[PDB]
Amino acid sequence: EVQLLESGGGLVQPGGSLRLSCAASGFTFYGSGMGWVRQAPGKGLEWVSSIYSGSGSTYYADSVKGRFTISRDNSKNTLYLQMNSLRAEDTAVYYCARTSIYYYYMDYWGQGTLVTVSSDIQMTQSPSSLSASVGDRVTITCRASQSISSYLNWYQQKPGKAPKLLIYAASSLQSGVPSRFSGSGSGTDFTLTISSLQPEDFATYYCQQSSSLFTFGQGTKLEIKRT
Amino acid sequence: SMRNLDECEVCRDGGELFCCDTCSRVFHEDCHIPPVEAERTPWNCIFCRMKESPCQESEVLERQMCPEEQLKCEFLLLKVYCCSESSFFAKIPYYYYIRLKEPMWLDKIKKRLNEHGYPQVEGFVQDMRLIFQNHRASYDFGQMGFRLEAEFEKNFKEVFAIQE
Ligand SMILES: [Zn+2]
Ligand SMILES: [Zn+2]
């Protein structure tokens, strides 16, 4: 029932401008925070901008400051990102994501639209890469530059798919997510744990702090062992 | 701004007031529970947040005070403080210096809850209930507290979805 559809992505000459829109349905649009998250081909997730209640409550990455302008029209249930002075750094798939204000997590993601061109909180994720077997106990960990209380989310992403929320509020299991997944930690140090690894759990896992703006972990690829 | 009131939602007084990003309610730093962090990006009050959240009582109390449980108790304590009777039960009880299970008052529960001093929901709910038990066993005070108690117990059931 909930749907986010992005559009406006395409080819631009460097220095040029582009306008992304995301059409939202299946939820009260004005009641929800809305974000843009991009991903370069093969690379990890990077928060770009999110808007809450109007133009007074807009937030941008240092990367895109004074260059991108986020906006919303609640009457048309649409989110916009105006993109100016475009670099190659900017070539990426731009996801439209809904931020629930319950504990500031992104529970709904669009397909993403592709743009082709011609003193924040850091999040370290150990290990970078992991090889495990079906049935094994997996523990990925996130450390934060400074304290982020319990404002820590865990996401799964699989090839050709949008990120999916596993854990919010450091240790709360998102509806639908299997019970083998569990989060722990508060302050700086956090842990995602899979009790009995399953074939479908082979994926990339990103953590994300919500405390002040959003910053994603580098990601952790969980791969099968040899037989 | 034109979209926020000029009286603190809890105590209806002026001074240093912090605007909720979504609703019109505004708060003194310490009037909101938990205290206002204007640092945040953005700041939403606990009512607007709890509005966007997604069984026997024995179960609820036994629950460890994890980030969600802690928020719900903070939500309940803010509602207690928003009731006009909160004044009476905020500080040391009047009876305390006169010549009874344990002296209890809202500011004591507020400090403990803000300090994460309750390991379970039970610790919070029991302290809240003790205020009224202690009250009942004294003096000439009419229905003072009847509303504060009734209100808490309605909200407690609703927030943790206790049996009908
Ligand atoms: Zn006040
Ligand atoms: Zn509010």
Q: Which residues pair with A22 in a beta bridge?
A: A6, A79
Residue type, A59: Y
Residue type, B20: C
Asked if the B1-54 domain carries CATH number 3.30.565.10, the reply is no
Q: What is the stated resolution of the deposited model, in angstroms?
A: 2.7
Eight-state DSSP code of residue A29: G
How many beta-carbon contacts under 8 Å exist across A and B? 48
Q: Which of A32, A53, A170 sits opposite B21 (nearest CB)?
A: A53
Which residues on chain A are in Cβ contact (under 8 Å) with B50? Answer: 102
Is the alpha carbon torsion for B115, B59, B86, B11 positive or negative?
positive
Beta-carbon separation of B41 and A171 below 8 A: no
Residue of A102, A151, A190, A209 to mutate when probing chain B, most B C-beta within 10 A: A102
**Cis bond before residue B34 (omega within 30° of 0):** yes
Beta-carbon separation of B21 and A213 below 8 A: no
Q: Which of A53, A59, A171 sits opposite B67 (nearest CB)?
A: A171
Q: What is the rounded CA–CA span in Å between residue B54 and residue B71?
A: 13
Query: Which experimental approach was used here?
Result: X-ray
For residue B60, give the H/E element and its range. helix B57-62
Q: What is the rounded CA–CA span in Å between residue A51 and residue A72?
A: 8
Domains for chain A: give ranges and CATH numbers. Answer: 1-118 (no CATH), 119-218 (2.60.40.10)
Q: Is A19 helix (H, G, I), strand (E, B) or coil?
A: strand
Pairing state of beta strands A11-12 and A113-117?
parallel
Q: Rounded to the nearest 5°, which phi and psi values hold at B63? A: -55, 130
Give me the long-range contacts of B88-92 (CB less than 8 A, separation at least 24).
B88/B144, B88/B145, B88/B148, B89/B131, B89/B135, B89/B145, B89/B148
Judged on CB neighbours under 10 Å (0-12, 13-18, 19+), B102 is exposed
Would residue A204 be called left, alpha or beta, if left means φ above 0 and alpha means ψ between -120 and 50 degrees? Answer: beta
Beta-carbon separation of A169 and B67 below 8 A: yes
Q: Which residues pair with A117 in a beta bridge?
A: A12
Using CA atoms in the order B35, B38, B39, B44, what is the torsion angle rounded to 10 degrees?
80
CB B69 within 8 A of CB B63: yes
CATH architecture observed for domain B55-164: Up-down Bundle (1.20)
Q: Which of A57, A59, A169 sits opposite B68 (nearest CB)?
A: A169
Is the alpha carbon torsion for A84, A89, A94, A95 positive or negative?
negative
Work out the minimum CA distance from A32 to partner chain B, whole angstroms: 9
Radius of gyration in angstroms for the set of CA atoms belonging to chain B, rounded to a whole number: 17
CA A45 to chain centre: 6
State how far the alpha carbon of B5 is from the alpha carbons of B13, B41, B121, in Å. Answer: 11, 20, 33
Q: What is the rounded CA–CA span in Å between residue A86 and residue A201?
A: 36
Radius of gyration in angstroms for the set of CA atoms belonging to chain A, rounded to a whole number: 17
Is the alpha carbon torsion for A121, A127, A128, A129 positive or negative?
negative
CB B152 within 8 A of CB B80: yes
CB A83 within 8 A of CB A18: yes
Work out the minimum CA distance from A211 to partner chain B, whole angstroms: 7
Which ligand has an atom closest to residue B7 CA?
1
CB B59 within 8 A of CB B160: no
Q: At what angle do helices B67-82 and B121-136 cross, to 10 degrees?
A: 30
Q: Does B115 touch chain A (CB under 8 A)?
A: no
Q: Is A199 helix (H, G, I), strand (E, B) or coil?
A: helix
Beta-carbon separation of B67 and A175 below 8 A: no
Residue of B45, B68, B115, B159 to mutate when probing chain A, most A C-beta within 10 A: B68
Beta-carbon separation of A172 and B39 below 8 A: no
Ligand 2 centroid to Cα of residue B11, in Å, is 16
Residues in chain A: 227
Distance between start and end Cα atoms, chain A: 42
Task: List chain B domain ranges.
Answer: 1-54, 55-164
CB-based contacts of A215, cutoff 8 Å, min separation 6: A47, A120, A121, A122, A123, A208, A209
Q: What is the rounded CA–CA span in Å between residue A114 and residue A148?
A: 31
Helix ranges (DSSP H) in A35-126: none
Which residues on chain B are in Cβ contact (under 8 Å) with A120? Answer: none
The token duo for A134 is: 């079906």
